[PDB]
Design a protein around this ligand. Structure first.
Ligand SMILES: [Zn+2]
Length: 164
């Protein structure tokens, strides 16, 4: 099922997600619905907060062929290094993109769709996406790294975009 993606301004996007208690069928259903939503909306990542589900669940696919499903349940950042940035977009801030400082490489641990723990060392676009999605789970949006003035313009453009 395709779920509705929250757009700013919406205080639900600023909520802190609680850790998933147990990866059961209900959690797997959320993960699958999130992937369906992410692909339908033509995105490379989606955090549960974005679909008004306040649990630490992220789905990602940064692959060219759109067939590399990554699931991060209760992710934890273990190590990071370097700095980089690209102009990021976000399904919750439609049609707006901006350069944000990110670590170049990150190493995380999380549970997969079967609830199995795994570790992943990421760099490039995947490291950036992981950081962006983890920020969503603690109610942080990429515009938060930008000056107050630029955030103002972003909100005005999104609000006017959702009026159409
Ligand atoms: Zn986002």
């Amino acid at each position: 099922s395709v779920l509705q993606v929250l757009h700013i301004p919406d205080e639900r996007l600023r909520k802190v997600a609680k850790p998933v208690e147990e990866v059961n069928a209900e959690i797997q259903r959320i993960v699958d619905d999130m992937f369906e939503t992410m692909y339908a909306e033509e995105g490379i990542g989606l955090a549960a907060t974005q679909v008004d589900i306040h649990q630490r669940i992220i789905v990602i696919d940064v692959s060219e062929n759109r067939d590399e499903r990554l699931v991060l349940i209760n992710p934890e950042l273990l190590e990071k290094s370097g700095e980089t940035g690209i102009e990021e977009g976000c399904l919750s801030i439609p049609e707006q993109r901006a350069l944000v400082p990110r670590a170049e490489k990150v190493k995380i641990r999380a549970l997969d769709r079967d609830g199995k723990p795994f570790e992943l060392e990421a760099d490039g676009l995947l490291a950036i996406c992981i950081q962006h999605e983890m920020d969503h789970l603690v109610g942080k949006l990429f515009m938060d790294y930008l000056s107050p003035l630029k955030q103002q313009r972003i909100r005005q453009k999104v609000e006017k975009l959702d009026r159409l």
